[PDB]
Amino acid sequence: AAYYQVVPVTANVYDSDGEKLSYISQGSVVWLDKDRKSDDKRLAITISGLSGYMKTEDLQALDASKDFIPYYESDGHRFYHYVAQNASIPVASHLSDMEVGKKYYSADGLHFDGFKLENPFLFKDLTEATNYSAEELDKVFSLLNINNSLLENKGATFKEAEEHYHINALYLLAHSALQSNWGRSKIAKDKNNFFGITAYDTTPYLSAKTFDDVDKGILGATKWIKENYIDRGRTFLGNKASGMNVEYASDPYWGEKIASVMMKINEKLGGKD
Numbered sequence: 001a002a003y004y005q006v007v008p009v010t011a012n013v014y015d016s017d018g019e020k021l022s023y024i025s026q027g028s029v030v031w032l033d034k035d036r037k038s039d040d041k042r043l044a045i046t047i048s049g050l051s052g053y054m055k056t057e058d059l060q061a062l063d064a065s066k067d068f069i070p071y072y073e074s075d076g077h078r079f080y081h082y083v084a085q086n087a088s089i090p091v092a093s094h095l096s097d098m099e100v101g102k103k104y105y106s107a108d109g110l111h112f113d114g115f116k117l118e119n120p121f122l123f124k125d126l127t128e129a130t131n132y133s134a135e136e137l138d139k140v141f142s143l144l145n146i147n148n149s150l151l152e153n154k155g156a157t158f159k160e161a162e163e164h165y166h167i168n169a170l171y172l173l174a175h176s177a178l179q180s181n182w183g184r185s186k187i188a189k190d191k192n193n194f195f196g197i198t199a200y201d202t203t204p205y206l207s208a209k210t211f212d213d214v215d216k217g218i219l220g221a222t223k224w225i226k227e228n229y230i231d232r233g234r235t236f237l238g239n240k241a242s243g244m245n246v247e248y249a250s251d252p253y254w255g256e257k258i259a260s261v262m263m264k265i266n267e268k269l270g271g272k273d
């Protein structure tokens with residue numbers, strides 16, 4: 001088959017030596033790589049920029065004529081990634097080379113047969129500060145109709161976290177928005193944990209770290225990200241080949257999702273970044 005789906009909760013991706021390169025989530029769809037050798041035990045695959053090997057034990061073959069395969073599609077204004085059958089995210093502006101309503105396929109969301117995307121937020125150095133002020137960040141809640149968020153009116157805390165830890169506050173807002181449903185998930189409300197800190201796939205709620213209050217949750221999560229990712233040379237969102245997404249999340253499109261939120265916020269606030 002050309003496409004395979006991940007069966008267990010997570011599955012590893014390996015190099016030719018059998019060394020672990022990353023891990024990907026249940027239901028993820030990987031492409032068979034016909035330029036490398038597969039055998040009975042391991043398939044040469046590509047996923048979210050990463051070319052490696054997966055155990056056949058962890059995979060189920062798909063039929064693209066009846067099973068969902070992730071794809072990209074333009075509405076004539078934005079290009080969307082269908083990451084699941086009923087969920088899309090905007091990744092880029094429409095390019096004249098895109099046919100509206102045509103499904104496109106890409107192993108990295110950057111290289112397509114007929115055009116190339118820039119996803120600048122996906123590769124932006126997260127140690128560079130946002131050009132948004134605390135007051136501008138606070139405006140996003142009204143502009144994106146975000147109701148009942150624990151993060152409302154916390155722009156000043158995001159900017160303090162940026163000042164102190166040298167981590168982009170637009171990224172911190174977008175990461176908390178995506179990971180905790182704008183500070184409305186049960187982990188957010190119970191644990192003041194807006195960033196999925198130690199929310200492991202096997203037991204996400206139980207494993208998630210606890211913080212004392214909303215401000216200590218924003219500052220403590222920022223500290224944790226700085227010490228565990230930025231200071232260890234993971235300085236951009238990325239994908240399964242490089243960046244924070246290699247280790248931070250099993251979801252192969254975690255980085256693309258956060259970059260999409262950054263893109264949406266930046267457009268609403270006037271394009272300063």
Ligand SMILES: CC(=O)N[C@@H]1[C@@H](O)[C@H](O[C@@H]2O[C@H](CO)[C@@H](O[C@@H]3O[C@H](CO)[C@@H](O[C@@H]4O[C@H](CO)[C@@H](O[C@@H]5O[C@H](CO)[C@@H](O)[C@H](O)[C@H]5NC(C)=O)[C@H](O[C@H](C)C(=O)O)[C@H]4NC(C)=O)[C@H](O)[C@H]3NC(C)=O)[C@H](O[C@H](C)C(=O)O)[C@H]2NC(C)=O)[C@@H](CO)O[C@H]1O
Nearest residue numbers: 023025087179181185196198199200201204248249250251
């Ligand atoms: C279309 C769209 O936009 N959809 C949105 C939707 O995505 C939103 O929902 C949110 O989705 C997120 C994924 O995109 C999901 O992310 C989860 O987040 C945590 C943190 O990122 C992550 O946890 C990782 O788990 C692994 C284990 O599986 C750990 O790796 C282990 O670490 C051990 C110790 O270091 C090590 O011994 C083990 O060997 C290793 N295991 C493996 C297999 O390698 C990670 O630990 C790392 C390595 C570390 O210590 O640094 C751990 N990361 C961290 C930082 O702790 C999950 O993988 C990830 N899940 C997926 C599928 O990616 C959000 O989940 C949150 C946390 C939650 O469950 O509440 C999810 N949020 C919600 C609210 O559902 C959605 C929001 O509503 O919005 C949609 O629009």
Ligand SMILES: [Ca+2]
Nearest residue numbers: 015016017019
């Ligand atoms: Ca190696």
